[PDB]
Amino acid sequence: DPFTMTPSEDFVVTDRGGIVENSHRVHAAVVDAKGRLLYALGNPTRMTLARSAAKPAQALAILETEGVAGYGFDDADIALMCASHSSEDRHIARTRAMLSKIKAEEADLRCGGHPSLSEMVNRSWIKQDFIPTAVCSNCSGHHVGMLAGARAIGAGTDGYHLPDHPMQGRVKRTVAELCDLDAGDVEWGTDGCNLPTPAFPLDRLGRIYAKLASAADGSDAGEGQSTRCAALAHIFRAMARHPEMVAGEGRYCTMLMRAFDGALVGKLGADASYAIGVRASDATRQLGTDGALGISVKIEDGNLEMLYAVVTELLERLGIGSPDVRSQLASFHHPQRVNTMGVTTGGVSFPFKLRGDDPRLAAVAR
């Protein structure tokens, strides 16, 4: 019965010959520039570890640290501070360039190597028996930013990654401020790169990216801006102009931002979160808001292939982009289900229902 559909039924499902294989619960929030909730799937206020979808907010703490401007970080450097890069050689090279700009060494990094986020890079590493190091971390440009901030204020580079360090005090404050949350409403764990990483309600992730895109609109319009809005507009512009620094070739974030060519930024969080800040457009206005928009997504079970499918389907349902823009993401939207002899064995479907109904139909966030 379609007249009693509920948030708890918001799934992305794969099939084999029409028989259900796997299904994945979806949570999504679409918010305006003040964080007002416009559309939802699942539980839009789910307490969620943002993971690297929080890196642009952490990068604002770096950019607002007195003295950092003196180092001459350029837009590509700042995109790398916002990144989960593929450890391509240009990412490793830019990390070494940034270390030189602040006169630090790779031994000053407290993040660690891992297998590349790109299969193609990993394949090359395997052939050469290469063991990744700190400078290869997908979060290396962010760790260099944190080192830069520590040096700028005279705090010292030892322990920049620890919560008692002044840089982490600044990060924690800035994240809660961008979310419009009290400190006790943001929880903190330890990330794969060994930095504190925040958790907060999923819609406030959307809220951070609606503020990024709104700042981009204020800047493009020539409006006087606070130092913070100017810094948010700089982050937006850096990500959108250097999206390959944010991820890498073949990566969803890079292909999404190239496709939209300035109209939005997007960023992955590990274990299948996603965030998008959408500049004001005919599409946002048709959706019922006069400003910018933020979108945030979490796949409950952590599946990345399903995340990219769902995010792409969500952009289509919200009317964001053109069929031709979004067709650049078609391999993510409808993942190949082809067996070892080249026969198509099934596919992906999206039995979820965006909600903004009989008044008696309860939408219990689940």
- Give residues in contact with ligand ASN (CB under 6 A): 51-52, 84, 138-139, 191-193, 268-270
Q: Which does 113 bind (CB under 5 to 8 A by kind): Cl ion, ligand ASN, its own copies, none?
A: its own copies
Cα dihedral 252→254→256→257 (10° resolution): 160
Contact status: 302 vs its own copies (CB under 8 A): yes
The yes or no reply on residue 339 touching its own copies (CB under 8 A) is yes
339 near Cl ion, rule: CB under 5 A? yes
Instruction: Find the binding residues for its own copies in span 62-101 (CB under 8 A).
Output: none
Q: Out of 304, 345, 353, 365, point to the residue binding Cl ion (CB under 5 A).
A: 345
Examine residue 185 and tell whether it contacts its own copies (CB under 8 A).
Answer: no
Q: Which part of the chain contacts its own copies (CB under 8 A), choosing from 18-26, 58-66, 311-319, 357-365?
A: 18-26
Segment 342 to 361, residues that bind its own copies, using CB under 8 A: 342-343, 345-346
Tokens describing residue 253: 């974030």
Q: Which of 28, 62, 83, 193 binds its own copies (CB under 8 A)?
A: 193
Residue choice 6, 45, 194, 225 for contact with its own copies (CB under 8 A): 194
The nearest distance, CB 348 to Cl ion, in angstroms, is: 13
Q: Residue holding tokens 């391509």? A: 88
C-alpha–C-alpha distance, residues 244 and 241, integer Å: 9
Q: Read off the tokens for 144.
A: 């260099």
Among 114, 228, 258, 317, binds its own copies (CB under 8 A): 114
Spatial contact of 186 and 199, defined as CB atoms under 8 Å apart: yes
Phi-psi region of 133 (alpha: psi -120 to 50; beta: other; left: phi over 0): beta
Span interacting with its own copies, options 10-18, 226-234, 251-259, 355-363, rule CB under 8 A:
10-18
Closest among 307, 315, 295 to 335, alpha carbons compared: 307
- How far is residue 223's CA from residue 96's CA, in Å, rounded to a whole number? 36
**Which H helix or E strand runs over 14?**
strand 11-16
- Taking CB atoms, the residue at the shortest distance from Cl ion is 339
Burial of 210 (0-12, 13-18, 19+ CB in 10 A): buried
H-assigned helices in the chain: 55-63, 75-81, 89-101, 119-127, 140-153, 166-179, 202-220, 227-241, 243-246, 252-260, 282-286, 304-317, 323-326, 330-333
Q: Does the footprint of its own copies cover residue 177 (CB under 8 A)?
A: no
Residue 136 or 178: which CB sits closer to its own copies?
Answer: 136
User: Is 166 a residue that touches its own copies (CB under 8 A)?
Assistant: no
φ, ψ at 75 (rounded to 5°): -60, -40
Interacting residue ranges for its own copies, rule: CB under 8 A: 14, 16-24, 47, 49, 110-114, 123, 126-127, 129, 137, 187-194, 197, 199, 271-272, 300-303, 339-343, 345-346
